[PDB]
Swiss-Prot record, chains A, B:
It catalyses: UTP = 3',5'-cyclic UMP + diphosphate. One of its GO terms (biological process) is intracellular signal transduction. Belongs to the adenylyl cyclase class-4/guanylyl cyclase family. Pyrimidine cyclase subfamily. Pycsar (pyrimidine cyclase system for antiphage resistance) provides immunity against bacteriophage. The pyrimidine cyclase (PycC) synthesizes cyclic nucleotides in response to infection; these serve as specific second messenger signals. The signals activate the adjacent effector, leading to bacterial cell death and abortive phage infection. A clade B Pycsar system. Mn(2+) 2 binds at residues 52, 96. Slightly more active with Mn(2+) than with Mg(2+). Its cofactor is Mn(2+). This is Uridylate cyclase. GO terms for molecular function: adenylate cyclase activity; metal ion binding; nucleotide binding. The keyword Lyase applies. Its main location: cytoplasm. The keyword Nucleotide-binding applies. PROSITE patterns: GUANYLATE_CYCLASE_2.
């Protein structure tokens, strides 16, 4: 069809066309980039956080839709409100998962504190409301994963003309970390090694445990800490 | 803080408030719903399609950034353009993954034809462009997964004030199908059983192979076929 011809032409132009790239520190506004063009912004260091609700199949399959809807809504609102409060830019949303990018001179400490605050919101705000209003033993499980790296971004048109796609290690690794079970927060060593001391130690106790990510050849750090919102 | 106080109050109201629900036959405008409220639309029958890349992490880690950006951009534009062309409504975007909802009397046939067209876009449009520009045998791997079920939706504020969360089997299962590797299109039995004959057979031969999804305890159907865009 005509769509096939249009896509063939544009796909060819995308593979053959020269790229135009500008370096920047902050997440761009979508209007800073040409839509569906070989135009990108290059962020030399940016910190990606994903916050993911776990156990969704279990929950959706067995629970009344009203309960599942309330879990999704409360987790996603708490997570997104806390991300915004810590200065993160929310860049994607899909189902169980929120993506944010942090920039600036405290991006790693901010992102990590954000993750620990999300754990507090789950354990200290949502969970007690769950046990009290529905009289259930259901436990809300979630993971926040964080990495930091160079990222490039281009403007695409999926939900609308203002979407951004992110190309770089942290966009992939932070997402992979949230796919792992058992710890509410996981960060790469590149994040941990930039944390202020108040984000690493409390009352003489380590807030993080090291865990080597054998597949990626880097260290990571996990935490069950909850930071009061 | 204002944040913790506001979250505690709103979370409590979200668990205690009764739901207001109206039935609808199409994907709602986000404005059809009250933001951050126990207000839902009930879609008695909907078909969910997810389309994603397979193996983007290793690609990003090993290929030139221009190559990865071209793969993401061309896959996502092809998939989203084909979804919209088949009358689907794009409901989520994150990284290498697109979600759409199809409604109406031909929703399953349209979604399945959409999936086979996406396979054609990959094999007949994008892959030859990879070969021509980059002169490489790197294979773009992708999966499209499809399920159909009742869904409820509510309006949330993640990227902006107009996000929708989708609650129901098809939103969960279609995403889970796309986490599996080895086949470009996977649909549940409930989708297969609604397909028009022209989407099931070609010259009297089956275009689909049955595969029991031992984890979910349901039958699925897979296809390696493609359909002209």
């Amino acid at each position: 069809s005509a769509l096939a011809d249009d896509l063939k032409k544009w796909v060819g132009e995308t593979f053959t066309g020269k790229w135009e790239v500008q370096e920047t520190t902050s997440v761009p506004n979508p209007e800073d980039l040409r839509l569906n063009s070989n135009h990108a912004k290059d962020l030399k260091a940016a910190t990606v956080l994903y916050a993911d609700l776990d156990g969704s199949t279990d929950m959706v399959n067995t629970k009344k839709w009203q309960f599942s809807a309330q879990i999704y809504k409360t987790f996603l609102k708490c997570a997104s409100d806390i991300i915004r409060d810590e200065g993160g830019n929310i860049t994607a949303y899909d189902g169980d998962r929120v993506m944010a990018v942090f920039t600036g001179n405290s991006k790693n400490t901010s992102a990590a504190r954000c993750a620990l605050k999300i754990n507090s919101a789950v354990l200290d705000i949502i969970q007690p409301a769950i046990a009290k209003k529905w009289q259930t033993d259901f436990v809300l499980r979630h993971v926040v994963g964080i990495d930091t790296s160079q990222l490039r971004t281009a403007r695409i048109g999926i939900r609308g003309d203002n979407d951004l796609v992110w190309i770089g290690r942290a966009a992939n690794y932070a997402a992979k970390l949230t796919n792992l079970a058992g710890k509410p927060t996981r960060i790469t060593a590149d994040v941990y090694n930039k944390l202020a001391d108040k984000l690493k130690y409390a009352n003489g106790v380590d807030m993080w445990a090291p865990e080597h990510w054998d597949d990626m050849g880097i260290w990571t750090y996990t935490s069950t800490w909850k930071w009061t919102v």
